[PDB]
């Protein structure tokens, strides 16, 4: 019959066990449940930007001008939205398995690796967008805070399309696509704190790694697309964080399974030219697209490779790019919900040359 | 307006009433992730004995692969090193050998805890038990400290630069004198409770493979409080720290008493899998969005006792 | 239609100076957990050096009121030294260990609000110059670089470790960006910072002596936020979820510029179970999605800053 009384918690045998003290608390308890009269009603309306957000996400190549404007969530802030696509011509080396890996590393169109047909790829070298310097800086300092033009990023969309350009007799082989959930990770290891007294003083510091690469192999996983090279292939990547999580920059020459530079056996994403001009910037919130082309001996396999990406970035207020910054899309919960719902309802990939 | 979806209901059952059904109902977090996951639904049930004349701390922290961390200390003394006890499934999930836990052998690239609970079930008789079980939750979170390290050994004393080292905040709260909120019952009454989301919204976590999660960046520091992988991390190392709070169980045993019990540690983990593991064949799409279930979960978590007698499950 | 806490949340966020007793209760989202809402708020007097451009940077670094830098009029500032809140010691510890897990009383934090008011105190005849305010999105970042693993065999064995950096500082220069407030010094200035994550994201601590563009301590030309006194007693604790406030005061030669500087900020923290502060912790406020949506909407609808004669 009392109010603020302490709560007792049942003793096994009330005769064989001494009584324990009733439980108390710090701070007031949670308020009594809210009444059902506090009815907050919602109008299911898709906003214009929310619709554009959806087009940019899934149907990247279907419009006159890239519709993307950013993610229509509660961020509602000052951003710079990159809506771009790297369209280039490529050739696949006869008698090889080529891997075109499209990962969310700002500034890079994709990562390539060539290997003996049937063999296991290890190092994928990045091919940057010509805009890299403009966005993240040039020179030895490229990618660092001093020359970077952004302080945070998140991917609103990313897609890839392979458009065969060989005739029906000169080519041969296959295209296979699947997605891997590439995520950065860390390992704590010792490093020298003082060189005296030998063998020196140590402490444990953190080094960066990347999980998921092992999934890039000749044997395609359950969820994949497999087809005749000449039919090409297209697909989109989608959010693997839960809410289009914002990402911080992590400038590195490589994202590998090992913290040892150039470790031959370690699978890794590697910036080209020793990172002299373009280094790895970080890893985004969407999953990674994997394209595997198998070109037999004598086969002439050529194609145009298109890599799309829409990135929302928090800009430095001093770049020449700042003049294009504005406020991001207004909150559209319906659009967001649609996105997360839709992302799971399409084939892992589709032929590009049939559309 | 609506009501709970099937998965949303299961989510709630798994979260709070882990030991109450025929088969673990858990399926994952019913939010908007709606993606490819491998969901671990497991419980480490083992027999234990508490050393007479010692304060034993059973810390149930969200470190994938580990059932709990144990520390034995003189009654009244300050515990400092809690050694992990791994699930037998560790190797299967995170790899074996010297490389255990690393990207090369790990089968996942991301994780988030959908639930975690612990239950202590006394097995002593009415003439041999003696002592108590004190339970309370602590918010363990990884943290960082920027410190200098040698960049070049020439010219002596060398060239330096500041690098980050990992640490963990919260451990200091694990001590003999518990907070007023603590549940303090007799050992013979056992204890049961669940942990809950302390992240913004069931945030996803990246792996951070380490031998220890301590207050200091110096290995083996005697005075540093720490979570420590057993056997020098030879086979099992710390994988990272989850989004839920940590459960603390302090069991006090006097000389002459025989306090034994079965210890159950539950946990439901959603993980983004490597597409090549032999486990991938079990991956599928996570539960469909159920906003009601989510609101309920976050509402209810703060509404139950810190812990209850184990014979109240 | 807004919950009690929801309304208080909005008040604390945008109009901190308007109330006698702070209404803030924390963020009314789905956290609903054990929190301790630290309300740091103090008042000092600042004197501006004649013939200099002075920068008062209010960044979300727990325990720090603001960072200052003074430079020749028109010059480029480089190092902003922090002025800690007198409360630092109680919150994050003291001594050489200050800020570390052993002495820190919290394990996670997130900013519910942060604002600053500059109230000129010079007379109308002797002051001269201007006040300019704007916000920069400061975010921590990382760079992977080599470090010595073994000193044998020379020149040693290496591995790549991560070092910490900070992006955005370069935006703090004499040339004010498009979105800014520019006014006569004597009119002062007030403004609030606001969430730049998408959901008031929780932050982990990262204890450091500086947050700079370079990983080399003391680098003269590296722009940086620097803990005072070599971090002997107070070190940088981390970087929050809100943007950073930049106050630039240009004081010509012979000008006599002074002002009262008042800063506020509400921070939700996950408390250590054992500190004296835990006693004052409690449950996060109840879910109020409307208040949240309102905040995120409202944050875009106000001038970058306003004169102090109307805070």
């Amino acid at each position: 019959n009392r109010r603020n009384k302490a709560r007792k918690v049942v003793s096994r045998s009330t005769a064989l066990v001494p009584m324990a003290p009733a439980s108390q608390r710090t701070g007031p308890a949670p308020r009594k449940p809210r009444k059902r009269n506090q009815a907050l009603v919602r109008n299911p309306r898709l906003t214009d930007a929310g619709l554009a957000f959806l087009k940019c996400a899934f149907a990247a190549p279907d419009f006159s001008v890239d519709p993307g404007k950013g993610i229509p969530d509660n961020f509602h802030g000052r951003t710079l939205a990159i809506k771009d696509c790297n369209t280039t011509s490529v050739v696949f080396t006869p008698n090889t398995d080529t891997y075109i890996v499209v990962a969310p590393v700002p500034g890079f169109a994709y990562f390539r690796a060539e290997v003996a047909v049937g063999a296991q790829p290890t190092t994928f070298v990045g091919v940057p967008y010509p805009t890299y310097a403009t966005n993240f800086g040039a020179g030895s300092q490229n990618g660092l805070p001093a020359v970077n033009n952004y302080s945070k990023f998140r991917y609103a969309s990313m897609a890839c399309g392979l458009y065969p350009t060989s005739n029906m007799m000169q080519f041969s082989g296959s295209v296979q696509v699947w997605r891997v959930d590439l995520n950065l990770s860390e390992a704590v290891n010792p490093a020298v704190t003082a060189i005296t007294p030998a063998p020196g003083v140590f402490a444990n510091f953190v080094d960066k790694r990347i999980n998921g690469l092992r999934g890039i192999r000749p044997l395609a996983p359950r969820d994949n697309y497999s087809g005749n090279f000449i039919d090409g292939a297209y697909t989109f990547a989608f959010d693997k964080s839960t809410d289009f999580e914002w990402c911080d920059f992590v400038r590195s020459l490589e994202f590998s399974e090992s913290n040892v530079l150039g470790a031959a056996t370690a699978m890794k994403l590697l910036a080209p030219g020793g990172g002299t001009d373009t280094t790895l910037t970080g890893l985004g919130n969407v999953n990674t697209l994997v394209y595997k082309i198998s070109t037999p001996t004598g086969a002439v396999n050529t194609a145009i490779l298109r890599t799309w990406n829409c990135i929302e970035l928090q800009p430095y207020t001093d770049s020449a790019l700042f003049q294009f910054s504005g406020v991001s899309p207004p909150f559209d919960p319906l659009a967001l919900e649609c996105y997360h719902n839709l992302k799971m309802r399409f084939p892992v990939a589709v032929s590009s040359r049939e559309n | 307006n609506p009501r709970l979806t099937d998965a949303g209901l299961a989510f709630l059952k798994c979260a709070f009433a882990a030991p109450d059904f025929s088969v673990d109902p858990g399926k994952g977090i019913p939010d908007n992730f709606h993606g490819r996951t491998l969901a671990i639904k497991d419980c480490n049930t083992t027999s234990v004995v508490f050393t007479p004349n010692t304060d034993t701390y059973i810390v149930v922290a969200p470190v994938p692969g580990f059932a709990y961390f144990r520390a034995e200390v003189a009654v009244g003394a300050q515990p400092t090193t809690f050694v992990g006890v791994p699930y037998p499934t560790y190797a299967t999930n995170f790899g074996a050998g010297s490389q255990n836990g690393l990207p090369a052998v790990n089968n996942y690239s991301k994780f988030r805890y959908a639930s975690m609970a612990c239950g202590l079930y006394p097995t002593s008789n009415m003439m041999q038990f003696s002592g108590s079980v004190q339970v309370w939750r602590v918010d363990l979170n990884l943290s960082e400290a920027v410190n200098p390290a040698v960049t070049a050994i020439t010219p002596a004393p060398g060239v330096f630069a500041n690098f980050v080292d990992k640490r963990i905040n919260g451990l200091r709260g694990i001590r003999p004198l518990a907070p007023r909120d603590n549940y303090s019952g007799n050992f013979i009454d056992g204890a049961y409770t669940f942990a809950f989301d302390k992240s913004t919204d069931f945030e996803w976590c990246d792996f951070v493979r380490s031998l220890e999660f301590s207050e200091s960046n110096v290995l083996g520091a005697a005075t540093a409080m720490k979570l420590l992988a057993p056997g020098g991390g030879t086979d099992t190392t710390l994988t990272g720290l989850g989004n839920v709070n940590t459960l603390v169980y302090k069991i006090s045993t006097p000389t002459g008493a025989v306090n034994t019990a079965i210890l159950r540690t539950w946990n439901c983990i959603e993980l983004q899998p490597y597409t090549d593991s032999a486990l991938f064949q079990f991956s599928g799409v996570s539960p469909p969005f159920d906003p009601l279930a989510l609101e309920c979960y976050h509402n209810l978590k703060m509404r139950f006792p810190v812990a209850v007698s184990s014979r109240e499950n | 239609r807004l919950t009690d806490a929801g309304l208080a949340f909005l008040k604390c966020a945008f109009a901190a100076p308007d109330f006698s007793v702070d209404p803030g209760k924390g963020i009314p989202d789905n956290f609903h957990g054990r929190t301790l809402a630290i309300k740091d708020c103090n008042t000092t007097s600042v004197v501006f050096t004649p013939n200099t451009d002075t920068y008062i940077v209010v960044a979300p670094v727990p325990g720090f009121a603001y960072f200052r830098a003074e430079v020749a009029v028109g010059a480029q500032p480089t190092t902003f030294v922090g002025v800690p809140y007198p409360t630092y010691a109680t919150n994050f510890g003291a001594g050489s260990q200050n800020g570390l897990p052993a002495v820190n009383n919290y394990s996670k934090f997130r900013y519910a609000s942060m604002a600053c008011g500059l109230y000129p105190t010079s007379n109308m005849m002797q002051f001269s110059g201007s006040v300019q305010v704007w916000r920069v999105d400061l975010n921590l970042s990382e760079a992977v670089n080599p470090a010595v693993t073994a000193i044998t065999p020379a020149p040693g064995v290496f591995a790549n470790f991560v070092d910490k950096r900070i992006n955005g500082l370069r935006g703090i220069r004499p040339l004010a960006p498009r979105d800014n407030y520019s006014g006569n010094f004597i009119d002062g200035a007030y403004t609030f910072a606001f969430d730049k994550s998408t959901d008031f994201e929780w932050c982990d601590f990262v204890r450091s002596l500086e947050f700079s563009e370079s990983n080399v301590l003391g680098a003269a030309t590296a722009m940086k936020l620097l803990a005072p006194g070599g971090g002997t007693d107070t070190t940088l604790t981390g970087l929050g979820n809100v943007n950073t406030l930049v106050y630039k005061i240009s004081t010509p030669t012979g000008a006599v510029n002074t002002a009262i500087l008042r800063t506020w900020n509400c921070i939700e923290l996950q408390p250590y179970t054992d500190s004296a502060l835990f006693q004052f912790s409690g449950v996060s406020p109840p879910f109020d999605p409307l208040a949240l949506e309102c905040y995120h909407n409202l944050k875009m609808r106000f001038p970058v800053a306003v004169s102090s004669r109307e805070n």
Partner: peptide
Amino acid sequence: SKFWEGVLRVLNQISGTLSVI
């Protein structure tokens, strides 16, 4: 008797926060 029974008790005092049309 099981914890769930207890959870259910409270789970029913909870009303929700949104509704669509």
